[PDB]
């Protein structure tokens, strides 16, 4: 049977967490924080938690996990979860800055920071530095846009959680993300999506508090499907499809998710699917003349003639920015029902693929995003293939897996679905970027060979030419696992990087 364990740092309360992880019939027991690797390498553990309290980070000798073991754990693709001091130090292994909080956090106090949408709400935001406008937090630090897969099926934004810590965590780690920000302690959690490194300064503990409790249930089960694993395979050998009434179909935008989903749908046979939208020079400019060749050639007998956009017209449309009509185009994923199918395959009986992930279809199922859009049209009007729900973002970046796919395609960063219709305002033309011959790919080309993809995750272009008030184009980069975090990174210290406080500019301002 499966098992979740503890690497305990300072747990005067750990039988409650064994009570938790075991309320859910999953196996849990105690081990020292200096427990041998050779022991834990044999067994079916896909979760490890850390527990601690008000132990000082300033004076070493306080509990600590070594490197080779950190590498060991990050390589096996097992997610990491720390509680207060455990997360205090998951932020030190990966970064590290904990100064002195004259105040404490004790007992159960209301914590209410959970989304990328928090200005006037917070009352304690003026607890330091005379913050007349609470966009400062949103600027210097940012949360995972994708609302709440954490705390699934509930959103009580008031989490009144047990704590007892005099010292406070003061800084954000890499792949910056911030799940909570309390009253006295305006930082209360930090979680990275792809590595799924959770960290929470609040201690659930005794039974008078709720929300905190179910977190461990959906924790155990949603980080890892233990008792019932199915991480690939299941819904694939699951396609009747009678006669030539229908075969599989693929939606594309240049996707790792679908670089191998191709194969999942393929089954060879000369072929059985078709591609949809994206020869766009916008997407990998070199692969516009070479996009459909490579999409035919990574697996040789593949096929390619997706009806596809190439860039974005200028003032054919609005010569201004209308928040409704700026970007609202999918631009290129279904979009058309008529002759998207090159054979008069049956109207609805024909199947479909999409590169939509459980973390990517969840923007869809949930609240439609304010700032950022990847790939819309996401069942209905077609045929339910249900491949979404299979695995996550890092899981499908690794979906290249044993397919041992070319690494220069993984060094290139993903592309959503709008193009430079997102955050490019109004008219424009040829003397302007339409084949994405600026920002993004620039970075990409020296992200591969100078050595920056290892640390930096993504980058894009933002052009602004509605009048000539002014017509600029401004650069910036993002270090994101989840779908939003774009803070200032130290590239070895009139295009602009990050002179502004991050907002009032966004990933796509």
């Amino acid at each position: 049977y499966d098992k979740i364990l503890v690497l305990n740092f300072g747990s005067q309360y750990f039988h409650l967490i064994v009570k938790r992880l075991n309320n859910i019939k999953i196996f849990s027991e105690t081990k020292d924080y200096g427990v041998e690797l050779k022991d834990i390498k044999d067994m079916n553990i896909k979760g490890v938690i850390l527990s601690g309290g008000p132990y000082s980070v300033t004076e070493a000798g306080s509990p600590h996990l070594k490197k080779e073991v950190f590498e060991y754990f990050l390589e096996k693709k097992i997610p990491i979860f720390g509680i207060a001091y455990g997360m205090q130090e998951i932020a030190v292994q990966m970064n590290g800055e904990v100064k002195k909080s004259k105040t404490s956090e004790y007992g159960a106090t209301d914590v209410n920071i959970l989304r990328n949408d928090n200005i006037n709400n917070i009352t304690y935001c003026r607890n330091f530095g005379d913050s007349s406008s609470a966009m400062d937090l949103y600027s210097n630090y940012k949360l995972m846009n994708e609302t709440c897969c954490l705390f699934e099926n509930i959103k009580s934004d008031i989490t009144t959680v047990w704590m007892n810590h005099n010292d406070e965590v003061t800084k954000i780690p890499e792949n910056f993300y911030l799940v909570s920000s309390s009253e006295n302690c305006l930082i209360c959690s930090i979680y990275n999506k792809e590595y799924n490194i959770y960290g929470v300064q609040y201690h659930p503990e005794v039974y008078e508090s709720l929300d905190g409790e179910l977190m461990f249930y959906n924790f155990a089960y949603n980080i890892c499907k233990c008792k019932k694993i199915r991480y690939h395979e299941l819904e694939l050998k699951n396609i009747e499809k009678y006669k030539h009434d229908h075969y599989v179909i693929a939606a594309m935008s240049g996707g790792i998710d679908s670089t191998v989903a191709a194969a999942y749908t393929h089954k060879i046979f000369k072929e059985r699917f078709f591609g949809i939208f994206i020869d766009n020079g916008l997407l990998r400019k070199n692969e516009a003349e070479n996009v459909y060749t490579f999409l035919k050639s990574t697996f040789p007998d593949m096929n390619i003639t997706k009806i596809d956009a190439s860039e974005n017209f200028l003032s054919n449309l609005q010569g201004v920015t209308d928040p409704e009509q700026k970007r609202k185009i999918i631009g290129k994923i279904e979009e058309f029902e008529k002759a998207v199918n090159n054979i008069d395959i049956d109207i609805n009986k024909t199947f479909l693929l999409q590169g939509t992930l459980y973390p990517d279809i969840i923007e869809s199922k949930c609240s439609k995003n304010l700032s950022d859009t990847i790939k819309t049209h996401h069942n209905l009007k077609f045929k339910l293939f249900e491949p979404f729900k299979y695995l996550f973002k890092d899981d499908v970046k690794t979906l290249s897996r044993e397919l041992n796919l070319p690494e220069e395609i993984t060094n290139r960063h993903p592309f959503p679905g709008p193009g430079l219709a997102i955050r490019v305002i109004g008219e424009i033309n040829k003397h302007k970027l339409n084949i994405l011959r600026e920002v993004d790919d620039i970075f990409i080309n020296d992200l591969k060979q100078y050595g920056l993809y290892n640390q930096i995750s993504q980058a894009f272009a933002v052009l602004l030419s509605s009048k000539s008030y002014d017509y600029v184009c401004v650069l910036r980069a993002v270090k994101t696992s989840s779908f939003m975090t774009a803070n200032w990174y130290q590239i070895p210290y009139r295009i602009l990087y990050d002179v502004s406080s991050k907002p009032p500019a966004t990933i796509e301002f």
Side-chain angles (χ1 to χ4, degrees), residues 1-30 32-54 56-94 96-99 101-153 155-192 194-238 240-246 248-255 257-270 272-276 278-305 307-348 350-382 384-396 398-437 439-474 476-508:
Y1 194 80
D2 290 33
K3 19 208 174 195
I4 316 155
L5 315 176
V6 81
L7 284 39
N8 137 75
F9 277 18
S11 68
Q12 303 165 351
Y13 22 58
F14 53 126
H15 200 77
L16 176 131
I17 302 298
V18 315
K19 278 198 301 285
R20 278 291 162 60
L21 321 153
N22 276 116
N23 273 318
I24 294 169
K25 182 33 76 60
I26 309 283
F27 296 179
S28 87
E29 210 201 309
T30 187
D32 195 18
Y33 68 96
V35 60
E36 284 85 355
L37 277 198
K38 42 182 175 174
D39 287 286
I40 48 192
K41 288 183 315 207
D42 294 77
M43 52 160 164
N44 194 299
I45 53 151
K46 292 129 38 163
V48 153
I49 206 88
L50 260 71
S51 288
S56 295
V57 197
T58 176
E59 275 125 11
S62 321
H64 32 267
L65 194 60
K66 294 168 301 187
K67 309 74 44 188
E68 82 255 62
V69 297
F70 203 21
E71 303 155 15
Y72 157 86
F73 210 57
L74 303 166
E75 295 153 19
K76 295 149 55 82
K77 286 182 46 187
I78 289 158
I80 271 167
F81 325 106
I83 283 143
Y85 187 65
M87 80 135 273
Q88 279 193 47
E89 306 316 84
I90 204 57
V92 172
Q93 307 194 54
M94 292 185 301
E97 224 277 313
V98 179
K99 214 170 179 175
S101 175
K102 311 182 180 182
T103 203
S104 176
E105 280 229 308
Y106 155 69
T109 207
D110 318 63
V111 193
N112 274 277
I113 277 71
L114 253 180
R115 284 157 273 264
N116 304 350
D117 195 291
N118 302 313
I119 299 185
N120 188 271
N121 172 27
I122 307 88
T123 320
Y124 37 87
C125 58
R126 311 215 299 184
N127 66 346
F128 35 64
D130 289 330
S131 302
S132 267
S133 201
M135 153 185 309
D136 49 79
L137 291 175
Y138 196 25
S139 150
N140 315 338
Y141 302 103
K142 329 174 145 49
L143 169 139
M144 309 61 67
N145 189 171
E146 184 35 49
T147 69
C148 312
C149 174
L150 50 99
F151 321 146
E152 163 178 316
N153 236 311
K155 71 148 190 179
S156 310
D157 186 39
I158 295 190
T159 184
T160 60
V161 278
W162 263 290
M163 282 98 51
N164 185 300
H165 71 83
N166 197 302
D167 44 314
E168 261 163 23
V169 200
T170 46
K171 292 251 153 216
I172 209 82
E174 267 198 332
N175 216 340
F176 332 84
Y177 283 128
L178 174 64
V179 202
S180 292
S181 298
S182 310
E183 189 236 345
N184 289 123
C185 176
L186 276 169
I187 178 165
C188 214
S189 180
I190 281 147
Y191 153 69
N192 173 70
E194 290 221 353
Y195 265 138
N196 267 322
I197 296 169
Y198 274 102
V200 175
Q201 292 183 212
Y202 69 68
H203 246 292
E205 285 328 281
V206 202
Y207 77 90
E208 292 76 45
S209 285
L210 288 74
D211 205 43
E213 174 205 357
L214 189 59
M215 168 217 161
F216 288 86
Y217 170 66
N218 42 68
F219 193 139
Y221 228 39
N222 279 0
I223 71 160
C224 308
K225 287 180 199 62
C226 301
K227 194 190 299 294
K228 247 198 66 175
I229 192 190
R230 265 324 176 228
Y231 77 110
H232 58 62
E233 283 277 349
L234 186 51
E235 309 280 56
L236 290 212
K237 208 41 189 310
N238 210 11
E240 195 35 56
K241 311 203 299 176
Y242 261 102
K243 282 315 109 186
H244 220 291
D245 289 21
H246 58 113
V248 202
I249 283 321
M252 72 148 278
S253 185
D257 319 8
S258 310
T259 47
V260 204
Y264 105 56
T265 45
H266 218 183
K267 269 144 240 352
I268 319 299
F269 251 3
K270 263 1 137 194
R272 239 171 294 117
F273 55 10
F274 71 49
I276 301 160
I278 301 270
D279 106 286
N280 299 91
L282 295 174
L283 206 143
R284 191 58 47 217
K285 151 189 160 38
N286 190 329
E287 281 167 356
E289 335 195 0
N290 289 337
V291 51
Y292 278 39
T293 59
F294 97 80
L295 279 159
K296 207 147 189 166
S297 297
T298 314
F299 308 75
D301 71 307
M302 201 164 226
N303 343 133
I304 216 63
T305 181
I307 294 169
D308 59 59
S310 51
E311 31 194 322
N312 216 232
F313 305 99
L314 60 138
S315 179
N316 170 17
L317 295 174
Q318 202 80 60
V320 205
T321 299
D322 274 334
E324 322 178 27
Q325 265 332 113
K326 185 238 310 175
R327 84 143 83 90
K328 183 221 90 82
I329 339 157
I330 291 90
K332 310 100 175 52
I333 46 160
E334 329 285 2
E335 187 55 89
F336 319 129
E337 296 201 52
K338 289 96 171 200
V340 74
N341 39 313
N342 267 42
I343 198 173
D344 194 331
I345 218 74
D346 212 335
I347 287 75
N348 280 346
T350 206
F351 260 129
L352 62 80
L353 159 157
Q354 300 228 17
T356 15
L357 305 151
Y358 186 27
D360 294 56
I361 208 179
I362 182 158
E363 293 90 43
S364 319
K365 308 224 155 195
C366 87
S367 170
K368 304 319 288 283
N369 186 357
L370 170 135
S371 174
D372 313 330
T373 77
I374 296 200
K375 298 183 66 198
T376 325
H377 300 291
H378 251 62
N379 306 66
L380 273 178
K381 284 286 198 301
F382 272 102
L384 305 125
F385 216 45
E386 309 145 321
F388 335 119
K389 95 189 152 180
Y390 247 88
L391 269 184
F392 265 49
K393 253 195 168 301
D394 190 18
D395 314 49
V396 295
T398 56
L399 207 67
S400 297
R401 252 169 60 203
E402 318 205 357
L403 293 312
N404 308 324
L405 278 187
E407 258 309 308
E408 300 84 34
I409 278 144
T410 312
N411 300 1
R412 98 194 206 219
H413 301 154
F415 298 86
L420 269 176
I422 189 42
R423 214 57 236 171
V424 164
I425 71 169
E427 51 278 80
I428 90 189
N429 204 346
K430 259 191 152 285
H431 263 272
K432 304 197 190 30
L433 304 315
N434 272 333
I435 317 97
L436 265 308
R437 305 199 198 219
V439 195
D440 41 298
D441 302 340
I442 323 182
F443 267 46
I444 265 50
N445 68 47
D446 266 32
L447 263 274
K448 159 184 147 209
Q449 294 294 99
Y450 192 64
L452 274 57
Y453 175 45
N454 26 85
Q455 325 294 55
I456 327 183
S457 50
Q458 292 210 67
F460 37 57
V462 162
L463 169 54
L464 291 127
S465 179
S466 176
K467 293 179 58 56
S468 148
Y469 30 95
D470 196 306
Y471 67 102
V472 287
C473 186
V474 169
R476 206 152 293 172
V478 317
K479 222 158 72 181
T480 59
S481 64
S482 197
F483 296 84
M484 154 190 215
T485 299
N487 218 356
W488 33 84
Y489 156 93
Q490 284 91 355
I491 294 169
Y493 86 131
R494 271 199 192 250
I495 175 181
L496 275 201
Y497 190 58
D498 188 280
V499 50
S500 63
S501 210
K502 239 304 301 182
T506 309
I507 261 192
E508 319 283 38

